[PDB]
Scaffold this active site. Structure first.
Site, PDB file in Angstrom:
ATOM      1  N   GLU A 143      66.479  51.423 -52.943  1.00 46.02           N
ATOM      2  CA  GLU A 143      66.640  52.706 -52.281  1.00 46.02           C
ATOM      3  C   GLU A 143      65.405  53.209 -51.512  1.00 46.02           C
ATOM      4  O   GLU A 143      64.849  54.269 -51.845  1.00 46.02           O
ATOM      5  CB  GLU A 143      67.150  53.748 -53.278  1.00 46.02           C
ATOM      6  CG  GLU A 143      68.643  53.579 -53.520  1.00 46.02           C
ATOM      7  CD  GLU A 143      69.248  54.564 -54.530  1.00 46.02           C
ATOM      8  OE1 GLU A 143      70.348  54.292 -55.058  1.00 46.02           O
ATOM      9  OE2 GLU A 143      68.687  55.644 -54.783  1.00 46.02           O
ATOM     10  N   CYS A 169      77.693  53.640 -59.486  1.00 42.61           N
ATOM     11  CA  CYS A 169      77.680  54.562 -60.642  1.00 42.61           C
ATOM     12  C   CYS A 169      78.456  55.873 -60.345  1.00 42.61           C
ATOM     13  O   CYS A 169      78.740  56.210 -59.183  1.00 42.61           O
ATOM     14  CB  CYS A 169      76.258  54.859 -61.121  1.00 42.61           C
ATOM     15  SG  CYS A 169      75.337  55.760 -59.836  1.00 42.61           S
TER      16      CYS A 169
END
Ligand SMILES: *[C@@H]1O[C@H](CO)[C@@H](O)[C@H](O)[C@H]1NC(C)=O
Ligand SMILES: *[C@@H]1O[C@H](CO)[C@@H](O)[C@H](O)[C@H]1NC(C)=O
Ligand SMILES: *[C@@H]1O[C@H](CO)[C@@H](O)[C@H](O)[C@H]1NC(C)=O
Ligand SMILES: *[C@@H]1O[C@H](CO)[C@@H](O)[C@H](O)[C@H]1NC(C)=O
Lengths: 497, 497, 497, 497
Positions: B235, B342
């Site tokens: 990320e 997630c």
């Protein structure tokens, strides 16, 4: 040496900003020459334990407030002052870079800082934790074959404790308190909620729980850390409350008496850590003197109890006299010790206010009351917290003297830090509180003590907005003329001969 | 071979309860003659990958929706399915007794479970850790002399991965992602927050960082573990915001390109680990096609990138065609791979909801969309969490397919575990996505693939409350009459000859 | 002018403090003389919309970045800019002393402030209320016999809107949106939750809900307040979600189209309020263009819809081109209008960061992007909030341009206030956006428009830390030679003939 | 007459469900011949003020705890029981249809209910209001020519009071309390925060504040309503704490003493409302004996004070003997009155818990303690709240004996309501507390009183889970054999002649 770097965050006062290369610190302490006094001053307007000095005069006339030392009137000896190395504190301090870590710990433990000589270490997790382990989570491990320290102890807490004791010149005393037992010791089989130890004192649940203390001590000892004392339980009264939100283990006063008498006392006494002291209560002072009576009037519990530990949270509805005063009255040979405080805590109260001067005064105010009612030490909660007042696994966020901003590699020393330091720095262990009679009524909180060596220290807090002129009289040496600025705290130090 | 023991925690479906001595499992898998199919069915009302068989008939009795397999329309080949072995997963798995640990690992990794073949390994800490660390925190160690694996890797992660690989028949591929560099390589000297590498691509900071990947792979190889692929940074877009709460290192698409060209590609290619694939992005797909345009139109960067890793996260992200599909159009020879998903989450919702059918449906709905837009693999985040979504040093905000309750030596397999397995179990490496045409607009999510040996697998998710009558045609075999009930997921397997 | 009186709270920038006697204000507006331009400048370092003037040159040399005006390339005409009079905003405003209330209002609504000309008004309660309530809470009251306004309207919102309109020179347009219907109209019987109107478009539930809009308008009319537009529903998609935490009413695009066609359109047409416009969507731009296609291709819904309203919370997953651009392409003659935005909405995101420059830039960056893709106005969320970001009955606290400190009788104007005002103050209703070609890639955000009177406004945002020298070129007049400092926003105004 | 309709919301006991057409009630009250007693019983298991009768015998068959009436040991007489008609209560009661409003009011005020005889009335707004306001907000109206009752009074509060008195057979006494003055009388010019009156007692502000009380009393008198008493300020100590959130007006005990002496007593004495009694303190009992010593040892202040009002705050509060008991000893001729109680935090429980038996027990426990320490009356907080504990303009934090669900035109009677009625229904004004001697240490909370006509009343609370066998002896009549079930509350009544 280096003065405070102030920053404001919109509250009544400034924080002092520390980072990896800079932090405010003291020169090595010296005593004032005979004939002269030392003064340390902190003010809402921004002064931070600033040193000045003045003469002690042979003569005073006037009708100003006069506080007279009564050196012959001896009360309790002091144990000390410190904070709690919780999982939250250790985690925030270790998330800074190494150099800033050292400045944070020098702030607390160094003589160039504020001379802490107490660290309270939790036995496994509490709310200031990021999960809920204990040291024996294998169910029915009554032999405690699978007892071990997790990384919270061996990677966070312990290393930092060693680092602190290395920075302090005063010996430091460690104090352990458990919040919960393993869940398979408990009637409700949970870390929280209403629930106590299963069975009845003397049995296998109670004997396992007491051996758990010794295993704790054994483990810390492999890591070369020794304890001064343990409490019987954190806030035993919490665990009697249904839906209690985080780690707890309930005892009625009677349950605590019989667990100490049957199990914890004998088990500690039969172990190599037999010199570790035991403190009962470790709870709000509203539960006094009753909890003291129930435990201490039973000589089979009483022989094992060194002292009574008190938390501050309900001080406000429990006048000191009726609780502490009376307890001392009944058991003058059983020390009273303050083991935990924070702001705030209360449903109306906001968590962390960077730079709050009101919170600072709450601390020194509560220290002065404690010392005036027999209490031998005072212990803050979390050493350091983040700007939210955590981490806290149950979002029970609170304030702390040192606030860590990990994204800045910086930390903020609050007014709570300096108000505490006005005591911890200048009242070594062994200091004996003595008399100090005011000549007329006033809005000051003052307290006098003598250091082991004979010399004097007086702290004076002004929580009202008006400057108050005062003279401190010590018949050995003379008069100290000074002023208490409004919203100030002062410590005075002088040789007596 | 052993059925699910269901338990309800008051959400729309049940978890499957496992403990030291019991867990649900499958028989070795076994598939019928031509003319017969296998159906595995999980329902909201409690069926968990239950097996039945039936005929593939030459006569078409269905008058409803028809899904026709088009085996000649051939798309991407599958790398596989897995999850992340974060500090948090390891700590949760390792707090079960060893027989419960084995049942847990077999659930994911063996053929008697759901057959994972991908493990993601963080390089040093992320938010799913109990402390901050990198492998090289001793400052200005520019040659990475003090680079080492802590206990998280040597005690928790590495043995767990070794045991996963023993339990696996399928080859397991490992994938590695950094969250942060040592903070002395960073603009902001902080493990979190807005902060990128110091200097500019090609310099000593950037070479040291790139060397850290080689030292990483060296270390794990000393432990007999080899990587399939590393990502360029987990990320990178987050390292460009604020005081980004968790471990990060910010890169603009440009800075990643240059780091890849100048440093990471060159460094990796120069080493024994030159066969390890490099994946770029590792971030939300909203950042595509742009990130790929930036990195891959540079021949100096592109020669070193084997694919693009994407995050799903999942409450949330962009249209598929515009991101995944457009990226595939522009760069048809660079694979797409889902490296992290997630759920939720989700301010009005728990991190963890035990038995949430809907979080399951969310997993399968998204894996399907993924497969339908050229993605070759899907890897879940934490393999296991506690009932709080932890441990997480910053905040829990996510669920996991398996939830461990260590105080009861038990674990719960969430509906998400079975939605993952409806793919992971029945889509081995090398399988190829193929056409499957719907005869009319409908509500189901369907994907067809072919096994390497030419047999067929079709998954069908029904996320609506209504039973859908269904027919599946294989041109080479016939008609499979079926029904997709409301709130179910089916996997059909059949031989084609 | 009274200048900004700055205050820091530790975030990137300062607020401007206002109390009952002082508040930063502008001098009355003036045109710069022909051949000269006006510049307003706000910077991170502390400048707040301050005025200067320079020459418009005959020629230019460089090489530097040149933004060229294209006056003949004409796009959308502007409706205006504003914020929401919620229960929370109104409550915080009327808790200051009267003279501080007028300073807050003049800030937004007068020429000596930032000239707002949109006020968005909730139809009953939303999350920014201190109770749930509708205008028709008597169960099954299909005739709406017990419909009435509570004090939230008659004592808080209404008197404050009369006052705003009195302070504004420009005409102000009121825009209304409902969050919920009476609970007896909904399938789930609750103000929140997943649930929509009972029955079918055309029927009693639907007709009653449409007459409630007319009854809202009737009531506001009784108090001399007229509406410009109503939206069909605040965020209709939120009522489709299970456990949605606060007030909502679910519509699919099809249910929306059909409620407009059958019920709301005809019902508003047959009333005295038939000139009030109807905006559909009033939700996230991700839902575009699909919601637009579903509604506007139905000529019976289409004849009733004036416009499409967009909230900003999912702008970042929804590139402006795909949503706003495509929708305009398909329906060029149905205006796009931004009807709500706020920051601090994620988890992730802190709530109120007093003096945050990032949030300021987030506001201006979004306004420019909206103006560059056809959108005709932009409405902020709550006009003011307390420092916790409320009140909010569900604790869903967010940021606001003005933060009210009731206890200090003071308010803080944030960087978001100034960022909005660089637009609201300088782009009256009827301004037409026009072309502005850059000479080379740059990191700037810029937009040009023309006032009704024919003159020019350009806004330029710098979100990079680098000063960027630019020239703006208008062919009618010459070159403006200037610099865009890093973290600055500028508005430029000049006469053209 | 009509029995409880139970409903469980998942707490330890039931609520009793009322609507427009049904509510549980009592028959007109009726009492048996000498030799027979009446018992009203409420149990956690669902019994609600159920009536049964039995014998009082010559022979004592009980071998357990004996409680012996001691009629000649005579204590305080009782003023009464009620709660507060706040804006929040009024708003809830009036959002019900008229028939349901009447059943709610008959519940509290009729003899077919529980016979309230005290209503406390806020003077203008407090936290349980939907807006801030006083009766004189026009700045600097020192003769209070702009003093007026808003709609909260004239629309909501006053008609509801009128209807309560129409329904009551007992005469009802009204108690008025101010929260804040007009803010132009306030050091801080704010409705909340740390702020007192401006200037010094005797002056223009203080005479204005005093006159405000008479203006209030004139206004209500025009609506045909007279006061029994007023308090000198609600929670005076609250407005000495920095930025206090709710409306306050701080007095130190000293400023209250001077305000009463110089201003308030003098003004009231000089008016037609000279008969209205004045209560001091109106705050937590921890402030006693101190507050009473300050005000009451000043004869200029004491001439003016009829009693001391106390708040019960109620998951705390200070020990009874040292506060209420000591205050009685020092000032035996000045009545103690409980002016406000509520539950509750703590931080981990909802404001409202529907059917919480524990909260009911807290009411009855604390009323009994009051009675045992010379308190003449007990007055609840908000009479009614919504299911959220609102509306509260600041924060919901307390429960209420009646919870109103407007959306269903229904109201819910809490355990708390019945725990109050076990007193208020059966202890009429002029009842005197009398001795009641327990034969041995026990768990019950018990109080005995005598009606003005000589008949006996005893209430017995069992807060434990065990049934307690019980004999009640009246010297004049005999022995009443009975059981106090676990988790019950009993009221016994009998003729003594
Ligand atoms: C640390 O603090 C000092 C004192 O303000 C300052 O001069 C220095 O720049 C700071 N260092 C960092 C890294 O911010
Ligand atoms: C483990 O699970 C099985 C099947 O549910 C059960 O019979 C067994 O009791 C469990 N073991 C323990 C220790 O509870
Ligand atoms: C209002 O602000 C001005 C400007 O800073 C200041 O001089 C004055 O103190 C303020 N007034 C009050 C009541 O604080
Ligand atoms: C009101 O309560 C009574 C008693 O339960 C019940 O029979 C009746 O249905 C209720 N009225 C409504 C509108 O539900």
């Amino acid at each position: 040496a280096r003065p405070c770097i102030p920053k404001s965050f919109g509250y009544s006062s400034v924080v002092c900003v520390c980072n990896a290369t800079y932090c405010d610190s003291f020169d090595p302490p010296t005593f004032p020459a005979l004939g002269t006094f030392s003064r340390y001053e902190s003010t809402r307007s921004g002064r931070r334990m600033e040193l000045s000095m003045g003469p002690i005069q042979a003569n005073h006339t006037g009708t100003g407030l006069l506080l007279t030392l009564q050196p012959e009137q001896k009360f309790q000896k002091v144990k000390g002052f410190g904070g709690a190395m919780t999982d939250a504190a250790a985690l925030n301090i270790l998330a800074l870079s190494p150099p800033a870590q050292n400045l944070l710990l020098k702030s607390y433990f160094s003589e160039e800082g504020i001379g802490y000589n107490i660290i309270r270490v939790p036995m496994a997790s509490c709310d200031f934790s990021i999960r809920t382990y204990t040291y024996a989570d294998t169910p029915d491990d009554f032999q405690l074959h699978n007892f071990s320290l997790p990384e919270e102890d061996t990677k966070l807490k312990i290393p930092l404790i060693h680092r602190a004791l290395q920075l302090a010149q005063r010996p430091v005393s460690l104090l352990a308190s458990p919040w919960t037992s393993p869940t398979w010791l408990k009637t409700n089989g949970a870390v929280n909620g209403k629930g106590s130890l299963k069975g009845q004192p003397g049995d296998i649940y109670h004997q396992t729980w007491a051996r758990y203390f010794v295993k704790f001590l054994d483990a810390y000892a492999e890591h070369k850390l020794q304890f001064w004392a343990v409490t019987a339980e954190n806030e035993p009264s919490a665990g009697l409350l249904s839906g209690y939100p985080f780690q707890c283990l309930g005892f009625t006063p009677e349950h605590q008496r019989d667990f100490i008498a049957r199990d914890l006392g004998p088990t500690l006494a039969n172990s190599t850590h037999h010199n570790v002291r035991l403190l009962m209560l470790d709870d709000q002072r509203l539960l006094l003197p009753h909890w003291a009576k129930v435990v201490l009037t039973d000589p089979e519990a009483a022989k094992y109890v060194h002292g009574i530990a008190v938390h501050w949270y309900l001080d406000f509805l429990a006048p000191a006299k009726a609780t502490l005063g009376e307890t001392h009255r009944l058991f003058p040979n059983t020390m009273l010790f303050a083991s935990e405080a924070c702001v705030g805590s209360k449903f109306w109260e906001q968590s962390v206010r960077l730079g709050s001067w009101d919170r600072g005064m709450q601390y020194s105010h509560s220290i002065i009351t404690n010392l005036l009612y027999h209490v031998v030490g005072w212990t803050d909660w979390n050493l350091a917290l983040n700007p939210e007042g955590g981490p806290n696994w149950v979002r029970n966020f609170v304030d702390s003297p040192i606030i860590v901003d990990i994204t800045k590699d910086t930390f903020y020393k609050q007014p709570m830090f300096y108000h505490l330091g006005h005591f911890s720095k200048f009242i070594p262990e062994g200091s004996q509180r003595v008399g100090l009679v005011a000549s007329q009524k006033n809005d000051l909180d003052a307290v006098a003590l003598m250091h082991p060596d004979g010399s004097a220290v007086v702290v004076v807090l002004n929580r009202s907005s008006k400057d108050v002129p005062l003279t401190i009289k010590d018949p050995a040496v003379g008069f100290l003329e000074t002023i208490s600025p409004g919203y100030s705290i002062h410590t005075y130090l002088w040789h007596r001969q």
